[PDB]
Design a protein that fits this description.
The protein is α/β, with parallel strands linked by helices. It has one domain: BRCT domain (Rossmann fold), CATH 3.40.50. The protein is about 25% helix and about 10% strand. It has a 3-stranded parallel β-sheet with strand order 2-1-3, covered by helices on one side. The radius of gyration is 14 Å and the shape is globular.
Length: about 100
C-alpha cells in the first residue's frame, strides 16, 4: 500500500518521537500530524524509551524536577523547521539545559 504523490518528501524528522506536555504553540493536535507527515512519531503518553524528546513551552518548578536530564525542546523548533523545510538546531530551543 502506497500513494502516488504524498506531497513533501522529507525525512528531516526520521525516527524522531515527540511528546507535547501542557500548553504549546501550535497545539498538540497540530504537532501530532505534522510529525507523521514529516516521517515522525507521536505518543499520547510520556515514554522514556519511545519518546525521544519532550515538546513544551513552559514547565512548573516542580516539573523541572521530574525532568532533570531529559531534553525539553520548545514547540517552535519543529514549526520553524517545517516552515523552512529543513531540520533546525535544538540547542537554542532547549528550555532548561
Amino acid at each position: 500500500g502506497s500513494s502516488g504523490s504524498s506531497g513533501t518528501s522529507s525525512t528531516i524528522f526520521s525516527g524522531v518521537a515527540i511528546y507535547v506536555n501542557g500548553y504549546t504553540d501550535p497545539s498538540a493536535e497540530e504537532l501530532r500530524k505534522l510529525m507523521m507527515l514529516h516521517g515522525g512519531q507521536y505518543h499520547v503518553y510520556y515514554s522514556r524509551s519511545k519518546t525521544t524528546h519532550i515538546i513544551a513551552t513552559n514547565l512548573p518548578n516542580a516539573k523541572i524536577k521530574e525532568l532533570k536530564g531529559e531534553k525539553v525542546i520548545r514547540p517552535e523548533w519543529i514549526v520553524e523547521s517545517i516552515k523552512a523545510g529543513r531540520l533546525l538546531s535544538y540547542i537554542p530551543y532547549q528550555l532548561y539545559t
